[PDB]
């Protein structure tokens, strides 16, 4: 298996069933907690030697499952659910990666 975000991308591209049970997100045999950190850097972080920060799986999955909402409505929904938001400058790039428009991102740190 690759990293969790790459697995999420694979499942999304194939439209394979993803199971959310409690705080687990399940991809076939594999499971991660909702709060696992992905390798996608949050816009605005990692400047001037300061730490990079990363979106959680929950944050990314919540965006993916709510792509039909306008970004402003999505921001409000995310607040209601207490799930951190994907920042607007990351939205198009992250969704394009998840949908297989791209196979990497300048925001993904992956050795």
Residue numbers in the entry: 1 to 111
Sentences reproduced from the published study:
LC-MS/MS analysis revealed that this protease-resistant fragment contains at least the first N-terminal 100 residues and likely the first 111 residues of hCDC73. We thus named this protease-resistant region as hCDC73-NTD. Furthermore, we have determined a crystal structure of CDC73-NTD at ultrahigh 1.02 Å resolutions and characterized CDC73 pathogenic missense mutants using biochemical assays. First, we determined the crystal structure of CDC73(1–100) using the SAD method (with a soaked platinum derivative) at 1.4 Å resolution, and then the crystal structure of CDC73(1–111) at 1.02 Å resolution. There are one and two molecules in each asymmetric unit for CDC73(1–111) and CDC73(1–100) crystals, respectively. The overall structure of CDC73(1–111) is almost identical with CDC73(1–100), with a r.m.s.d. of Cα positions being 0.894 Å. The extra 11 residues of CDC73(1–111) pack tightly on surface of the CDC73(1–100) core structure. Indeed, our Thermofluor assay showed that hCDC73(1–100) and hCDC73(1–111) have Tm values of 46 °C and 56 °C, respectively.
